[PDB]
Write a protein that binds this ligand. Structure first.
Ligand SMILES: [Mg+2]
Ligand SMILES: [Mg+2]
Ligand SMILES: [Mg+2]
Ligand SMILES: [Mg+2]
Ligand SMILES: [Mg+2]
Ligand SMILES: [Mg+2]
Ligand SMILES: [Mg+2]
Ligand SMILES: [Mg+2]
Ligand SMILES: [Mg+2]
Ligand SMILES: [Mg+2]
Ligand SMILES: [Mg+2]
Ligand SMILES: [Mg+2]
Ligand SMILES: [Mg+2]
Lengths: 96, 287, 140, 103, 190, 100, 275
RNA sequence: GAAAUUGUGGCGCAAUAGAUAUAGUACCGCAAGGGAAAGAUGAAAAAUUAUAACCAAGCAUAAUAUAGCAAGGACUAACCCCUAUACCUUCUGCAUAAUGAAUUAACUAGAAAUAACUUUGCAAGGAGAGCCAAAGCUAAGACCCCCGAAACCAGACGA
């Protein structure tokens, strides 16, 4: 019986956390900051996709180029395999 | 506004209010349910439903339409074709009217670019502007123009108005520099000497009947006269009018820019222009 | 798993509610229940048409029964009533037969009379008075 | 279906049509929220169309609780003892009014 | 959405450990045909169409559009009586309580956005007051933005900040094509 | 404090007097404020007197003194919603309650 | 451990419902349940029936002696009904007598009395009260309200009404409410008796100065164990009534009953009665 | 398929998920190698307390009564009357005596842009360089599955 008896502990959420209070502050820095910095330089993330939208396969490719050199053998291989698969799936398998 | 007034009523516009305009966001058709599940838009067995359908163009083993036709040089040497973005006289006139592009100064490519009449792009092998006949009549400029090709009619039009059409040549590299000079400056190299016509453009720019910058200026007046004879109207003598001093300036070649020599290094921050000295370097620049 | 169904029990229960009173696993096991419940639903929808037919047949049977007690057949009766312009529906006629027998008897008599009149008319091809319980009220 | 559902016969409580038609509705209990889109329609009804309704039928005695309710309900209590309890959740004002009338 | 880089990953049937071997032969056994233990149908097999990779959701709205949005937001704030201009930000005390009291008196709101330019020319007192107050937030005008405005029940701008805004936001109107990026100098632009 | 405001009870004359004090001629209602300083003087003074500040959403609207007068003449009442409900001639069927 | 909340809540609700179904509470009086204003409800009640009356005077018609006693006890730790209730009972009875007499004069006095009793007895009246929502507004010691108490309350209400508007109005009300509980109900259900034959004989004597013979009209079965004896009742070679039965005695009894009904202006036919 | 040239967290999982992992253990394998499962009290077990229960299938409490896809129309009545050829798939066509499915539980399958359409933005221009532009251009939104061989080859391990 997947459904349960004890209803959960109350999910407390401060909507005025230091994160949420200042979410989006400085974001939009170009159009009112003499274009010193692009908003794409605000974002913090994995280097291979920083201000770059991409696609599944494309992302993989980017990762392989940007980072692959300094990537863990067990994971690099996996990445390569993924790329191989992904190309096949896109360039051949689907509809239209 | 009425809308603003209305907004005095209604609640404060919060994140809990907001909604995208109808039509902007389409519903997402995903395949769970009796309408969109079961065969799920794929059909029945075969090579459709399994994916695996053969490539685009293939015609089931009949020779493909694209392969059945014979080859032919339509796009044979297209990356080695010179491509000239056209500027119609009408456009030029409009620009003049609007204030951007000042006819009291010379009209070089750079000026035009700044104005944003003619956008051009060295990648995709543009070799500059070509002056075109489109606003032949209904034109009134009286201006000198450095332009990379010119129709005869266009030339005539300008001349009748008391202007000076001079054609000029910008190598792809030179052209790039011309188009956006500030980025070149930022890059930090010395302003290079532009190269000459390659081989088959040399006979163009050495003739005075298309106002070539290497053509002998003794024949220019003759050419002008000839033009006048053909298309009616009288040549306005240039020497008498007040702007002659500016109309005489001719961008003496391997210079790129109208004031700056080849070999100048333009320091933008802390505004100076560094010049080369050193005899050999100077000689090279001259060459 | 990102998002998996918390509310599935309820869906199961929705169908099992309708299956409670079936025999055997049909009322316990959701898979079997669903098929049965749907079938039941289908039957119910179909049954509406059947019900109406059945009722009318029952009424006809009752009226026939009543009519035979007065020496008349159903069809004769109905036809004569139609001729008379007495347009009582068969539910109502059945009710009459059950609950208000003298009225039913009277109706039967009337029908018989009408029939007789018709018969009479048939002998003499045309004319004269058409008979008293014959004729028709003309609306204009 | 009819086999599943419990059945009933037609009747009228305490012979209403004979003597006097008696309003069988005793009480409408309106659980509403002060804040919450759940009960905007309900709020509107309370503001404008409830008083009029009350005036129209004085045998009914309306209650309105305003009880920070996440889902608003209107509890209709009848003369026999039965309690028809129905939701007002994100309904338009007109619809709500209609529902009330039906009750 | 433009910053959002979702970090959710799962293992495809390739990336899960082992199971390249046929569990039992295809045709002999009376079981379901299978190729790999670790196929999606199996317990602790690979995920079919799971989330995979850090996914970036980045997209650039036209700068002009962004500007318009800001302008629109400002308009809304003024229209709705929630915008308040100040001669300056300057609290005599620099106490959190005091500010709150003032707000209450003036019927400002639950939360109050305070805006005054630079960051470096901030009044100390105001800084002191806001810092402890969760809701009463300070931003330089460079940081002012739509979402924040939406969040906060009031907008409180200085005159200089207003001026700055005017300067910036009207410049998206009556301008040229970029030609090249505005970080590079031009004649007019700073 | 209170948002509640009743329009006077004089007012029409008082406003005129104020105007005179600030800046007198014929057609006093038809005077355009236009000059900013004058506007600041008048409106602020009125607010100080009446306890009724002109909204900055509505500030652009009143160009003339007539507009200002019109604005002043309409009432505002704080009340609270329960109170309002109570006021609004409740028949003996209704029993509204507030659980806060 | 799934990620939600709503589902859990729903489940909890369901569980609660189940519990309620299983072990329900000792049914509580409506005054204790939250939404409830006494005066307002009284007013509503007054409005509902379509005749106005004094609210101070009505309120007292609900207050019971037991309740008063309880209150006193509580205090230790009002007028009451009697004056009105008695009046209500008596006047109501009189009204009933008048109506019935007007309708069917061939009914005997005893029969009429019985009918009245049935109308105003512990059951029917109680039922009526329940239907009307008297039980809610009444306030007594203990719960559910015992039937006698309910009856008393009802009569007090009637008395109050009489005091307020007028006799005619009260009569009308009575007609509407109490008397409409003999609509389907034939005689003998209301005024139950033993040995109808004797009664018939007496009635016959009163009327014609004669005695009835009891002939047997029809019979299917008899030896079957499911007979249908259809037995008449003849007076000077003319049947006054005729009834059916499983046995002959039963049939005779039925016939007698039918005859009685015929005599006392009843039958199933009757006349609809004017409202 | 190039080059010049240009240039200290989480809208994550939370015990069939997340690592194969409470473990590379147990177990299987001559060996290389394969490779699991599962735990869940309370502040206190130096409180064994007593209640928290109520909820899958399966059972039990509770065997059965003519007749028939398990029901529906009903009916005062559970049956009795009348109506009624399970489902999915695969088929020209299936009650078929064609496939699949004992049942419950949880897990288990449409993912990609050109080109279109849409609604915003700006507009002879658009676009945060490069790209496109004889109304365009920028923007988002919206289409494109899962399971299954016999096989081939590389490198180990086994007489
Ligand atoms: Mg299916
Ligand atoms: Mg298929
Ligand atoms: Mg096929
Ligand atoms: Mg061939
Ligand atoms: Mg593998
Ligand atoms: Mg395989
Ligand atoms: Mg796994
Ligand atoms: Mg695990
Ligand atoms: Mg069970
Ligand atoms: Mg049968
Ligand atoms: Mg087969
Ligand atoms: Mg092969
Ligand atoms: Mg050996």
């Amino acid at each position: 019986i997947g459904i349960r008896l004890t209803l959960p502990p109350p999910k407390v959420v401060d909507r005025w956390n230091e994160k949420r209070a200042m979410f989006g502050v400085y974001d939009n820095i170009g159009i009112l900051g003499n274009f010193e910095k692009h908003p794409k330089e605000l974002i913090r993330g994995p280097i291979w996709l920083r201000g770059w939208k991409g696609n599944e396969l494309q992302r993989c490719i980017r990762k392989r180029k940007m980072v692959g050199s300094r990537m863990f053998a067990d994971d690099l291989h996996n990445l390569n395999k993924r790329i191989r698969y992904l190309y096949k799936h896109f360039n051949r398998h689907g509809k239209f | 506004a009425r809308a603003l007034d209305l907004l005095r009523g209604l609640p404060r516009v919060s994140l809990a209010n907001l909604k995208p305009n109808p039509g902007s966001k389409k519903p997402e058709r995903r395949p769970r349910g009796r309408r969109r599940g079961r065969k799920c838009g794929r059909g029945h067995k075969g090579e459709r439903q399994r994916g695996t359908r053969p490539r685009l163009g293939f015609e089931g083993g009949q020779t493909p339409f694209y392969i059945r036709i014979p080859k032919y040089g339509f796009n044979e040497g297209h990356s080695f074709r010179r491509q000239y973005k056209p500027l119609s006289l009408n456009r030029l006139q409009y620009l003049i009217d609007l204030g951007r592009v000042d006819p009291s100064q010379p009209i070089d490519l750079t000026q035009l670019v700044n104005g944003r009449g003619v956008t051009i792009q060295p990648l995709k092998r543009d070799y500059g502007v070509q002056l075109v006949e489109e606003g032949a009549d209904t034109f009134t400029a009286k201006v000198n123009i450095e332009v990379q090709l010119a129709s005869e009619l266009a030339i005539a039009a300008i001349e009748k108005n008391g202007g000076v059409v001079t054609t000029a040549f910008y190598d792809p590299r030179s052209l790039d520099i011309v188009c956006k000079p500030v980025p070149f400056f930022l890059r930090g190299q010395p302003i290079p000497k532009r190269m000459l016509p390659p081989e088959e453009l040399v006979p163009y720019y050495t003739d005075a009947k298309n106002r070539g910058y290497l053509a002998d200026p003794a024949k220019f007046p003759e050419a002008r006269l000839e033009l006048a004879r053909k298309y009616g109207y009288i040549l306005p003598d240039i020497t008498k009018d007040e702007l002659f001093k500016m109309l005489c300036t001719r961008k003496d070649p391997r210079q790129i820019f109208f004031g700056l020599a080849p070999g100048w290094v333009v320091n933008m921050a802390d505004k100076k222009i560094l010049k080369p000295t050193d005899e050999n370097l100077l000689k090279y620049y001259t060459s | 798993l990102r998002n998996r169904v918390t509310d599935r029990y309820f869906r199961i229960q929705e169908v099992l509610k309708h299956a409670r009173h079936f025999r055997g696993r049909k009322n316990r096991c959701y898979r079997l229940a669903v098929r049965t419940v749907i079938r039941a639903f289908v039957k119910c929808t179909k049954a509406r048409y059947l019900k109406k037919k059945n009722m009318r047949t029952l009424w006809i049977n009752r009226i026939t029964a009543a009519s035979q007690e007065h020496g008349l057949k159903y069809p004769a009766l109905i036809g004569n009533l139609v001729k008379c312009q007495v347009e009582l529906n068969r539910k109502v006629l059945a009710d009459l037969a059950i609950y208000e027998p003298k009225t039913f008897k009277s109706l039967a008599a009337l029908a018989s009379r009408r029939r007789h009149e018709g018969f009479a008319a048939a002998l003499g091809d045309g004319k004269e008075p058409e008979g008293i319980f014959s004729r028709v009220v003309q609306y204009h | 279906t009819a086999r599943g559902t419990p059945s009933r016969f037609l009747a009228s409580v305490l012979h209403n049509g004979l003597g006097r038609y008696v309003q069988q509705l005793q009480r409408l209990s309106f659980s509403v929220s002060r804040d919450g889109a759940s009960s905007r329609g309900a709020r509107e009804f309370v503001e404008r169309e409830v008083i009029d309704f009350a005036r129209r039928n004085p045998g009914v005695v309306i209650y309105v609780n305003s009880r920070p309710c996440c889902v608003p309900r209107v509890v209709a209590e009848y003369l026999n003892g039965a309690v028809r309890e129905e939701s007002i959740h994100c309904k338009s004002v007109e619809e709500i009014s209609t529902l009330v009338q039906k009750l | 959405n433009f910053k959002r880089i979702s970090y959710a990953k799962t293992k495809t049937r390739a990336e899960v450990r082992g199971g390249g071997r046929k569990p039992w032969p295809q045709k002999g056994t009376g079981r379901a045909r299978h190729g790999s233990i670790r196929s999606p149908l199996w317990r602790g097999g690979g995920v079919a169409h799971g989330p995979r990779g850090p996914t970036s959701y980045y997209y650039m709205l036209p700068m002009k559009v962004r500007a318009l949005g800001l302008k629109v937001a400002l308009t809304v704030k003024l229209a709705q009586d929630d915008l308040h201009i100040m001669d300056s930000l300057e609290l005599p005390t620099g106490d959190p309580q005091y500010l709150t009291e003032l707000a209450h008196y003036r019927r400002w709101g639950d939360s109050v956005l305070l805006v005054d330019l630079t960051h470096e020319e901030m009044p100390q007192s105001i800084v002191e007051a806001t810092s402890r107050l969760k809701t009463f937030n300070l931003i330089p005008a460079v940081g002012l933005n739509v979402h924040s405005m939406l969040k906060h029940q009031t907008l409180v701008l200085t005159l200089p900040t207003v001026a700055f805004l005017e300067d910036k936001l009207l410049w998206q109107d009556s301008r040229y094509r970029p030609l090249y990026p505005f970080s590079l100098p031009y004649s007019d632009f700073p | 404090r209170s948002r509640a405001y009743t329009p006077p009870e004089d007012l029409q004359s008082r406003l005129e007097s104020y105007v005179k004090e600030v800046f007198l001629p014929s057609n006093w209602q038809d005077i355009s404020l236009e000059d900013s300083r004058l506007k600041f003087n008048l409106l602020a003074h009125l607010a100080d007197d009446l306890g009724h500040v002109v909204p900055n959403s509505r500030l652009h609207q009143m160009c003339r003194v007539r507009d200002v007068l019109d604005f002043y003449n309409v009432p505002i009442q704080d009340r609270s919603k329960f109170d309002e409900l109570s006021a609004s001639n409740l028949p003996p069927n209704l029993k509204i309650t507030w659980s806060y | 451990v799934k990620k939600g909340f709503r589902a859990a809540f729903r489940f909890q609700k369901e569980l609660e419902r189940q519990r309620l179904l299983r072990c329900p509470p000792p049914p509580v009086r409506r005054s204790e349940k939250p939404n409830w204003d006494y005066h307002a409800e009284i007013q509503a009640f007054g409005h509902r029936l379509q005749e106005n009356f004094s609210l101070d005077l009505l309120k007292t018609a609900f207050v019971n002696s037991c309740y008063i006693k309880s209150e006193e006890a509580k205090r230790q730790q009002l007028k009451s009904n009697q004056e009105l209730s008695e009046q209500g009972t008596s006047f109501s009875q009189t009204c009933l007598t008048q109506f019935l007499e007007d309708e069917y004069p061939d009914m005997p006095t005893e029969g009429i009395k019985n009918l009245v009793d049935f109308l105003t007895g512990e059951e029917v009246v109680c039922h009526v009260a329940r239907n009307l929502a008297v039980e809610q507004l009444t306030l007594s010691e203990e719960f559910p309200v015992p039937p006698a108490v309910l009856q008393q309350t009802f009569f007090a209400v009637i008395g109050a009404l009489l005091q307020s508007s007028g006799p005619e109005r009260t009569a009308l009300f009575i007609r509407d409410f109490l008397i409409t509980q003999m609509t389907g109900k034939e005689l003998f259900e209301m005024w139950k008796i033993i040995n109808p034959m004797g009664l018939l004989v007496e009635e016959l004597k009163k009327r014609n100065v004669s005695a009835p013979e009891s002939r047997l009209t029809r019979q299917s079965g008899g030896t079957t164990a499911l007979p249908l004896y259809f037995v008449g009742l003849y007076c000077d070679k003319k049947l006054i009534a005729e009834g059916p039965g499983e046995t002959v005695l039963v049939a005779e009894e039925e016939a007698a009953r039918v005859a009685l009904r015929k005599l006392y202006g009843f039958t199933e036919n009757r006349r609809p009665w004017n409202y």
